[PDB]
Amino acid sequence: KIVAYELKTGGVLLHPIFGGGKEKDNPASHLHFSIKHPHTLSWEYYSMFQCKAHLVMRLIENRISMEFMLQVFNKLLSLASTASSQKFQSHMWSQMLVSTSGFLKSISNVSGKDIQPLIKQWVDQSGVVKFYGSFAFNRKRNVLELEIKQDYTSPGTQKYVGPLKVTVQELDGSFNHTLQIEENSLKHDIPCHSKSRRNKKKKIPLMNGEEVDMDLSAMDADSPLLWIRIDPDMSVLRKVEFEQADFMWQYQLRYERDVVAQQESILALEKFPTPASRLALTDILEQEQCFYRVRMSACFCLAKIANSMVSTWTGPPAMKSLFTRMFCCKSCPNIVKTNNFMSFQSYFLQKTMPVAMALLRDVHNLCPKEVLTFILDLIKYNDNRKNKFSDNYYRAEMIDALANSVTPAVSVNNEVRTLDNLNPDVRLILEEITRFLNMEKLLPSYRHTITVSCLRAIRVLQKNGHVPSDPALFKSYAEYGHFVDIRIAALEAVVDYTKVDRSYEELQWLLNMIQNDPVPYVRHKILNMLTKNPPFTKNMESPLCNEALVDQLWKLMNSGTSHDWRLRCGAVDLY
Amino acid sequence: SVEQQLYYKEITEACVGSCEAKRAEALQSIATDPGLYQMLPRFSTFISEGVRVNVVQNNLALLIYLMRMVKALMDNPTLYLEKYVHELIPAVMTCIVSRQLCLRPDVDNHWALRDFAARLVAQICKHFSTTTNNIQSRITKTFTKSWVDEKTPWTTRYGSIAGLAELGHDVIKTLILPRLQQEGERIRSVLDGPVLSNIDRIGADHVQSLLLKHCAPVLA
């Protein structure tokens, strides 16, 4: 995720981590945040400042080893800074001041070479975008030749190290590799590895099954060359440019041992144009050693790829297979109160099997009857559950399931008007959408279901548009006080509805409710969310041309002086 | 279940509440809602217990609300009331005949409990008597016994004869016409008597009116 934000140069939208206030700091266009007062310290818990500090500390471990940096930080905690005067006055500080100048030195002494350069190309003008791949394989020599360039569109561009591994997979995906590539334009020579380094683990007694000689008709035709899978384990954090990539994604889906690769090999299966893998990645649909999220984004492959042509409804039986994930609803849902749902094998993955359906429904508009049939059965499963801890995640990402079911279902748009007389849908779907009005809300200390059941309310009333029904809940729901969650749930949907609404009055009332609501921290939340979603579109008619907002702006500056150090960089962004 | 228990609770809560608007709403609900078939015999059991208790608290309002609730059940086309006819009859009969339904105010309040109870027994007779056989003889014997007992107060008698009168024209002719002259001599007893005063004036007006106006159509 930090890569997404570090692929951004030229006005938007990146910052340094090591922020040294020097006198001659001439480039502050993109650094607005010093590190001077108060709120510029508060704002270095933004995601780049956390998990890119995380990232760099994980690297420096591997260079200065782990046992050594252990002895480092264990001494640092118990290294004592005393004060001692000649009338015997013993002072003790640790639990008492310690310095970062001697931190630098201590790790330097133990382990490592030049750390000034390396850390300089995390904070300043460094890192890469795109790695160019091109391939060859020559029959006569058995030498399989790779040509990896690398490329970085920005002012201040260089050539960079990034350990870039490749593992070639023979006829039956039973190969090996290594590689390194760390110069700008490199051509690297991979020796006569017809037989893998694991020639006889049980790797190639697979092509040595009977596909060494029987399919020597299609190995001695090396036109299907040795299939060079690209970037294991996100080994270098780049955008790859690598023609003909379907086999590479499959081979990483099946035979890779680290699942960091896999979840990215199915993000690439999702997006890059791939021939039929659908039956094969059902292996990794139910590989019961795999993460919640790789089983999820294995469903989301079939979701994204979404038919291509007119075998749309041939995907779908495999989807409704794990639409009943061994769902035994003849004892359920009365003994699934008693169970923990068995997570239903992660409800991240159950969500995105009826949401593979729903994406397919969205993408091609000759689906929608059969999907509706599918997701009608998910609705028959519902309204029979009680409260259970794990089953919050089921309910919460089944309300995203049920949204984008009525959403395609009335995607004959032209306003909402009224949706004419679709009582069958609107009633029943609102019945799940709203809360049980008998059921008191002073009992659950959590609220998930009805946080994302105002979201089931919106987005089924956003794809058409029932304007003033939505905020007329969320205003009431952030006044009454009870339930911290519920309040934020309401306030996040009052700004998701302003994100669509573009009558000026609603934005006025929204910066009034920013001003004084008067929880200070929910005040920030709203202020940032209006600062994220802009009030203009492509057109540029009176851009940022206000007079009273700019007074409010300067009056929200120096409310740092009072407290909230995430309010004044609200102002700082809208300055 | 949570939803069925909640609506049960809410309807019982609305029975005792002085909110006569909210009890009237609970009556409408019990006649109009589908799905109630499991919340039969829990209703009826809690109604019949409440009718015992409130007979021995003289609370006419609670008793009329419980009669109205039994009527709503009996009228609800989504409730198969038959099985529980044999419970609802002796509760409703206890309201018609009861020696301690004191109708002690303004007759309107507790004349209207005996009377309303009798109108529910009259529905139940006219709807189930054919199908059950037991039901007609059980009811007619208990009401005839009351009305014809010299030693049962005006209030018990008037209740039983109102019930008889409204059961059926053919019951009026057969029980109540031949009994008419015998009961006006013996047990004029003015209403079985005091018991009476102006409640043999209004209640033996009503008896002579309902006798004249079921005599006239059983002739016609």
Partner: peptide
């Protein structure tokens, strides 16, 4: 009153669903 009616309807629906489930099991 309206709210109460809605609640009742919901309860009825739930009951129906339960019945259906039972039938399926049978």
């Amino acid at each position: 009153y309206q709210v109460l009616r809605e609640k009742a309807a919901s309860q009825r629906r739930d009951v129906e669903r339960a019945l259906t489930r039972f039938m399926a099991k049978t």
